[PDB]
Design a binder for these strands. Structure first.
Lengths: 117, 120, 110, 56
RNA sequence: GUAACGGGGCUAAACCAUGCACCGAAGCUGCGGCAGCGACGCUUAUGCGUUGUUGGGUAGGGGAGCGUUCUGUAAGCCUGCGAAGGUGUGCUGUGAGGCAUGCUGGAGGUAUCAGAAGUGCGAAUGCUGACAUAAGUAACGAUAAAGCGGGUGAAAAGCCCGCUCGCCGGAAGACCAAGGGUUCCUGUCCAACGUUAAUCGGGGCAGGGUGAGUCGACCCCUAAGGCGAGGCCGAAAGGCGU
RNA sequence: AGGACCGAACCGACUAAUGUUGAAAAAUUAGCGGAUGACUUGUGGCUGGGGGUGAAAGGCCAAUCAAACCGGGAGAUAGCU
RNA sequence: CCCGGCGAGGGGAGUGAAAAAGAACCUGAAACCGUGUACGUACAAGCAGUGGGAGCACGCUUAGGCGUGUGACUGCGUACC
RNA sequence: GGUUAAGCGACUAAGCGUACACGGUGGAUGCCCUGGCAGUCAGAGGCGAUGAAGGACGUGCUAAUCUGCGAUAAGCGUCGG
């Protein structure tokens, strides 16, 4: 029983093309070349799903260091004071507080200094 | 480099170019008007105008030289008989060039070259 | 108002007629007419014929007063290509593509 | 003497950008006949600088 | 081309001893989601109030699944108030996929469970058709050479006529032999060809044109050589030859 | 008289240049050797594949020759890509 | 009927369910070639992607983002068999 | 409000990239076939010197092809449907 595969091939090609839509040059026009992009795009997405956590941690650490140095204390000393005071707040909320409300961050820093000293 | 040199080549050798100029000058002076490409008329001025300059004067040797140039007994007869007196009072500028667009065959600059005459 | 006009199966190539089309793209009817008339291209007359057809269609089949008309949409497109075999050196055979182009002119008052 | 890889339509269009022509934009109207003609060229009918030059 | 800290740059931002802090992975921990393995309290062709553990992977081995043609189900069902294909969208499943619909289409398709594959393409210097690339680049096919005027025509350098310039002229002239089969002439057209246009052509359509006792073929004879009545030879075919 | 001499047609390609997706699947310009004999050519045949021919190079046998082309064994076989 | 060259083609009219069913004629996708729209781009280097990401252009309930296109800049990132 | 200076700073697209709408080359997918492949049921397994198969030339009102036919030439005669 001869079976024609044109419909299935076209469906798969359209799926790949719609996945690859938005790329530059032939990467969004040629299925043979667009297929490589979608696999590479998936690999990049898989890597970035992990890289994003560490990059946001980096940004939050930088923001906390900036705020602490502006207030008159180093990031390491501030974190040590928080740990000695038994504060479980994380870098994300710490950075949000530092960015928006300065008085709250001043309270955090002074409590950390009191715990340290 | 062609610094100050004069004389177009027209994609032709010396013999072909001189023959072309001779024939074109003969036809131009025979018919009082011809149609030719603008470079051809520009290079043909320097040939035709001295013919009229020479024809201004009349003598046996002048007639012989005017025949040797343009190699046409009828043309030389027309010269010294009608081309002389009709321009005896004109010093230079015996020819006029009017651009008339481009040839359809190959899009070449076309222009009509004619004497300053024909005010009948 | 569309008043479309086209000349399918034109001998001139689209790549060489787009150059002429761009000159008149978005200009007034009279300006385009004179530009095409005095343009030194075969495509110039080829598209001037189409422009004349379009303006005649506007005059007859549609509203009069061609004075307030502009060439809004004009575009040149390739057409069917004819295969020709040209002998070459060493017995090699290459294929000559006699390219034809479709030219469309749309003229509207607004 | 041959290409290692196929150039792209973007580069092709960039190269062809300079191939576009320029309109004359110098239509001159005859003083007498009021006809459009190329500057320093005779009209189609044969009128130049008002006076006739072709007599045909 | 500095090029033997990565660079900036550093006299501590260089090396030894110690300490307290922090950054530091897909490692661990916290949460949620999925699948396999063994247990016990129970469900008993299956959930688990559970428990511990496993889940990187090529060749390879095992298991479970998605897609299409056709057959039974199926003379049942959807379908001209719109089937199949095409084309975008929103949901949905760890997935091959599935569902509905905007527009084209126009009359076929097919639920669930089973049966067989010519059953899934991204490569094999793969095959067929088309389109790009180079690129609007080389080239436009002996360096014997065209110009002007008039004519037709929408358009003239190449089409027709006239005057000039040039080439072959033991040929680039005229007859034939062999070889082609109407390309020869006229009227008519620029659909396709002429390496460009063409009104022109050895291009498209129609018509006309080839007259032999003395030309040649045909015919009589024949060389080289072929066939070959009988005849000789050879497994057959067939080879020689009067 | 000359398997004579110089030199046309004719035969061949010894040198240089161009041409290597060229005008041409070995060509064109000028030089170059023979040009009355072992010369050449038109026509018609004979010698057919482990065979023909070969002034003999492993040369030619329809642009293919240390064994032509066409169809079959044959989808030969490939421990190879 | 008109433009056009007593052409080709096209535009009107009519036939036809349908003429983007017009003989280059069922359904009519891709590589490839343009037009218009919105964005970005002429001091910025490399598999041209991914995560973040300001702004701009389109509609929404509410008046804040949400659906799509674009996306400067930034960490990482040397195609497939 | 004006003169001068410093800082910051959009508006440009010859062309190009993305997404959308509209176009074209293109004959892929979908549907149909008087076209092919393999079998079962039966016949027959030959045609021809009272001139076989296969062909040339002719054969209509018609310039040409297919089909049938042969100067009685898309044909003629007898008997049946």
């Amino acid at each position: 029983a001869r079976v024609k595969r044109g419909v299935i091939a076209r469906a798969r090609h359209k799926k790949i093309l719609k996945q690859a839509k938005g790329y530059y040059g032939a990467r969004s026009r040629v299925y043979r070349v667009a297929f490589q992009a979608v696999i590479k795009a998936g690999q990049y997405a898989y890597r970035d799903r992990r890289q994003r956590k560490r990059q946001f941690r980096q940004l939050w650490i930088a923001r906390i260091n900036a705020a602490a140095r502006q207030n008159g204390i180093s990031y390491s000393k501030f974190i040590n004071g928080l740990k000695k005071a038994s504060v479980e707040i994380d870098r994300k909320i710490l950075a949000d507080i530092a960015v928006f409300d300065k008085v709250a961050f001043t309270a955090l820093v002074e409590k950390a200094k009191a715990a340290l000293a | 480099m062609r610094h100050r040199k004069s004389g177009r080549q027209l994609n032709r050798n010396s013999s072909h170019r001189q023959a072309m100029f001779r024939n074109m000058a003969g036809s131009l002076v025979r018919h009082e008007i011809i149609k030719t490409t603008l470079p051809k008329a520009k290079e043909l001025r320097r040939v035709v105008e001295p013919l009229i300059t020479l024809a201004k004067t009349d003598s046996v040797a002048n007639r012989r030289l005017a025949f040797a140039r343009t190699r046409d007994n009828e043309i030389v007869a027309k010269l010294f008989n009608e081309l002389g007196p009709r321009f005896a009072s004109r010093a230079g500028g015996y020819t006029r060039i009017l651009k008339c667009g481009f040839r359809a065959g190959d899009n070449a600059p076309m222009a009509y070259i004619e004497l300053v005459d024909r005010s009948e | 108002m569309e008043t479309i006009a086209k000349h399918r199966h034109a001998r001139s190539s689209a790549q060489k007629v787009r150059l002429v089309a761009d000159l008149i793209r978005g200009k007034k009817v009279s300006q385009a007419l004179d530009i095409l008339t005095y343009t030194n291209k075969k495509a110039a007359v080829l598209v001037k014929k189409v422009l004349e057809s379009a303006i005649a269609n506007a005059e007859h089949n549609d509203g009069a007063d061609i004075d307030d008309l502009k060439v809004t949409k004009i575009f040149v497109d390739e057409g069917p290509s004819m295969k020709r075999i040209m002998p070459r050196a060493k017995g090699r055979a290459d294929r000559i593509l006699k390219r034809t182009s479709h030219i469309t002119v749309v003229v509207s008052d607004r | 003497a041959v290409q290692q890889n196929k150039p792209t339509r973007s580069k092709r269009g960039m190269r062809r950008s300079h191939d576009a022509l320029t309109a004359v934009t110098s239509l001159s109207v005859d003083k007498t006949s009021g006809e459009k003609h190329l500057r320093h060229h005779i009209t189609a009918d044969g009128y130049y600088r008002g006076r006739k030059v072709i007599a045909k």
